[PDB]
Design a protein around this motif. Structure first.
Motif, short mmCIF file in Angstrom:
data_model
loop_
_atom_site.label_atom_id
_atom_site.label_comp_id
_atom_site.label_asym_id
_atom_site.label_seq_id
_atom_site.Cartn_x
_atom_site.Cartn_y
_atom_site.Cartn_z
N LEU A 153 58.14 34.92 31.42
CA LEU A 153 57.22 34.66 30.62
C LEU A 153 56.90 35.99 29.83
N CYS A 154 56.70 37.14 30.66
CA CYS A 154 56.43 38.33 30.13
C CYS A 154 57.38 38.86 29.05
N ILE A 155 58.53 39.05 29.79
CA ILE A 155 59.74 39.44 29.16
C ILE A 155 60.08 38.58 27.94
N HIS A 192 44.10 26.68 49.41
CA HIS A 192 45.35 27.14 49.56
C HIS A 192 45.85 27.50 48.14
N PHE A 193 45.74 28.96 47.94
CA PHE A 193 46.20 29.48 46.69
C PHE A 193 47.40 30.45 47.17
N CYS A 194 48.14 30.81 46.03
CA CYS A 194 49.15 31.76 46.04
C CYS A 194 49.08 32.67 44.97
N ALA A 195 48.48 33.82 45.32
CA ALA A 195 47.95 34.78 44.15
C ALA A 195 47.87 36.28 44.70
N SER A 196 47.79 37.10 43.99
CA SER A 196 48.00 38.44 44.23
C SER A 196 46.66 38.87 44.79
N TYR A 219 45.12 41.80 44.39
CA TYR A 219 44.48 42.58 43.10
C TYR A 219 45.04 41.83 41.90
N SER A 220 44.78 40.56 41.85
CA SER A 220 45.37 39.96 40.59
C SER A 220 44.70 40.49 39.32
N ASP A 221 43.50 40.41 39.18
CA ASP A 221 43.02 40.56 37.96
C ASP A 221 43.09 42.17 37.38
N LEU A 252 45.86 44.69 33.20
CA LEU A 252 46.88 45.60 32.67
C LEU A 252 47.83 45.03 31.80
N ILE A 253 48.35 43.64 31.90
CA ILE A 253 49.42 43.07 31.27
C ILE A 253 48.97 42.55 29.94
N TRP A 254 48.05 41.74 30.01
CA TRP A 254 47.08 41.33 28.71
C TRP A 254 46.66 42.32 28.01
N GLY A 255 46.09 43.54 28.74
CA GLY A 255 45.82 44.62 27.61
C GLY A 255 46.78 45.39 26.94
N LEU A 300 42.77 30.19 27.37
CA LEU A 300 42.52 28.68 28.04
C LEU A 300 43.24 28.61 29.13
N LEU A 301 44.72 29.12 29.29
CA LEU A 301 45.55 28.82 30.40
C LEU A 301 44.93 29.70 31.68
N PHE A 302 44.46 30.78 31.32
CA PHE A 302 43.96 31.73 32.39
C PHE A 302 42.65 30.89 33.07
N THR A 341 43.93 27.72 35.01
CA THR A 341 44.61 27.98 36.27
C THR A 341 43.46 28.76 37.22
N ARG A 342 42.73 29.42 36.91
CA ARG A 342 41.70 29.97 37.69
C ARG A 342 40.78 28.91 38.39
N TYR A 343 40.23 27.93 37.61
CA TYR A 343 39.37 27.00 37.86
C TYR A 343 39.61 25.72 38.30
N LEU A 344 40.80 25.19 37.80
CA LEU A 344 41.25 24.07 38.27
C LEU A 344 42.55 23.87 39.07
N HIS A 345 42.25 23.94 40.41
CA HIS A 345 43.53 23.90 41.29
C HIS A 345 43.50 22.42 41.93
N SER A 346 42.35 21.71 41.61
CA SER A 346 42.44 20.09 42.04
C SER A 346 43.15 19.45 41.05
#
Ligand SMILES: CCCCCC/C=C/CCCCCCCC(=O)OC[C@H](COP(=O)([O-])OCC[N+](C)(C)C)OC(=O)CCCCCCCCCCCCCCCCC
Ligand SMILES: CCCCCC/C=C/CCCCCCCC(=O)OC[C@H](COP(=O)([O-])OCC[N+](C)(C)C)OC(=O)CCCCCCCCCCCCCCCCC
Lengths: 269, 289
Positions: free
Chosen positions: B81-83, B168-172, B174-176, B181-184, B227-229, B232-237
């Motif tokens: 995505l980022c590339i 159960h989440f699969c995340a870093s 130090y995710s934020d 960094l990348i969004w900035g 919107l996708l952030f 993704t953060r609040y709707l895992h159900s």
């Protein structure tokens, strides 16, 4: 838990900034009929000074802790910062828009300051409703959380007992993302207007470098301060100093690029 | 896992978008010597289309669930995505910078020589910043898929409550930090892109000028990212909702960008193909404010 030396250094720096703000306000409220100052819309700049002093007051309000009224404290200081940056970045984009219109639409062939103030007031009303929905739907209620967590990643089992205390909303990321989004769209249109009013007129009346450095500094400051607020909350001196420093550097930088050319042109006249 | 009908419609839309991208690639390769395509930058359009197919493949991998090493799958979807975003929003900024330098350096002699290799170098520098950020993210704090069960005994101002939350989440860890960094970095890039779109606002015709595509793409990029952030953060159900919203956001942004780039070229290809009597046929393409 805040060291008095850091508190004193921060308060002295913010007082120096506020004194510079008052000096700029006096200069732009006294020399209204001067040609140089009148050429750069003196009645719009009062809004910028009011936003600047509002941001400095919010930076002060970050400097008090330890009161069950911390929630009102955080809500007031965050809303004050939001309204302040709104009032700072309103008139700059308004002046840029008016300069672009008088540069472009006058070639085939007039906007008053009241129209730009109306656009600014609409922008402030948007900020007001966006803050009212936050303070009305889910407050910033502080809770004492004690919990025990078991970590099973599939290879080892470990247990952790954490007693974390923080002051945050139920869905804080929604509100920070939505305020970030509205301000980011505003700064994007500001950068577009900066490009449109590129090499059009003199920097006393052309606000192109000012808005660009302000937008870049606002983005980097917001990212850095959100990072140091979310994770290193166990470093309260660092968080307070970095927040006050970022607000001071930003507010002073935009106000200096706005008003240093005015004083430089007034020195020779 | 995921509903089959939503996966089918998402895959159909992404396949249609990818076929559209391949058609645009075929048009760019074929009519590269046409005068209006030559007055655009077809070589940079190749790089834009490569970024487009990378982000379409990212949207494809967003549906791959209940298969894997899912921790590596998250890395390999977000990295591409980022590339892809870098490769899409690089050449447009380079083209706008060339337009600004060509039309605002009206000095006798001293002609500007900005070849395509310089702009591929600039895109390579942007991608190098991207890959060092992604390498730091994948080496220092990799995303790990962890399942944790916990109980919390919280106390309010006047009430005490106990909750047993197992997730159960699969995340870093130090995710934020990495998100900021990348969004900035992307934010600084897109703000300079808005500056370039402003500078080149009335510089040429929409086939050559890229102001509207930059502004539309940057606004849609900010809206989609926020919107996708959030979802993704609040709707895992709601896995179907987050999958559909992510795929639709990627598809909408990439399709609108590529359509804004290539549809006016296809519209005006005929007018500069057969006769081409004089250069007065392209007079709006030499415009200026
Ligand atoms: C014109 C000059 C001004 C420039 C100054 C810009 C600097 C801003 C930094 C201050 C904001 C950091 C505060 C962090 C939030 C906090 O206090 O926690 C309470 C909480 C966030 O909590 P938290 O996430 O920090 O900690 C809890 C962590 N936990 C995991 C438990 C959730 O905030 C909220 O509840 C949401 C309300 C949003 C407040 C609005 C933000 C004000 C920012 C002012 C700048 C506006 C314009 C910038 C936007 C982007 C620009 C492109
Ligand atoms: C040119 C058109 C391109 C359009 C594409 C724009 C849309 C982007 C949507 C990205 C969706 C993010 C998916 C989140 C996955 C996830 O949960 O990872 C776990 C973590 C966060 O976890 P979480 O918070 O999402 O869920 C767990 C919740 N919990 C509270 C338990 C932590 O995400 C990361 O760590 C990511 C690290 C940084 C990687 C950067 C990804 C690249 C983003 C796209 C490229 C940049 C373009 C946007 C910039 C624009 C700026 C305004």
């Amino acid at each position: 838990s805040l060291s008095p030396v850091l508190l004193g250094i921060v308060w002295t720096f913010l007082s120096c900034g506020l004194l510079l703000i008052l000096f700029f306000l006096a200069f732009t409220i006294h020399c209204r009929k001067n040609r140089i100052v009148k050429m750069s819309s003196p009645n719009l700049n009062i809004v910028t000074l009011l936003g600047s002093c509002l941001t400095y007051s919010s930076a002060y309000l970050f400097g008090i802790q330890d009161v069950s009224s911390m929630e009102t404290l955080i809500q007031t200081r965050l809303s004050m910062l939001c309204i302040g940056t709104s009032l700072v970045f309103g008139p700059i984009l308004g002046k840029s828009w008016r300069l672009y219109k008088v540069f472009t639409q006058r070639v085939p062939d007039i906007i008053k300051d009241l129209q730009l103030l109306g656009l600014v007031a609409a922008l402030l009303m948007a900020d007001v409703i966006l803050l009212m929905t936050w303070v009305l739907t889910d407050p910033i209620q502080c809770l004492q959380i004690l919990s025990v967590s078991m970590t099973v990643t599939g290879k080892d089992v470990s247990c952790t007992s954490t007693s974390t205390h923080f002051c945050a909303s139920r869905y804080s990321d929604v509100w920070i993302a939505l305020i970030w989004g509205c301000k980011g769209l505003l700064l994007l249109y500001g950068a577009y207007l900066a490009g449109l009013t590129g090499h059009v007129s003199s920097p006393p009346v052309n606000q192109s470098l000012t808005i660009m450095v302000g937008v870049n500094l606002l983005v980097l400051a917001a990212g850095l301060l959100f990072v140091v607020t979310r994770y290193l909350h166990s470093w309260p001196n660092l968080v307070f100093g970095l927040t006050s420093g970022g607000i001071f550097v930003c507010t002073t930088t935009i106000n200096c690029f706005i008003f240093i050319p005015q004083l430089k042109q007034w020195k020779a006249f």
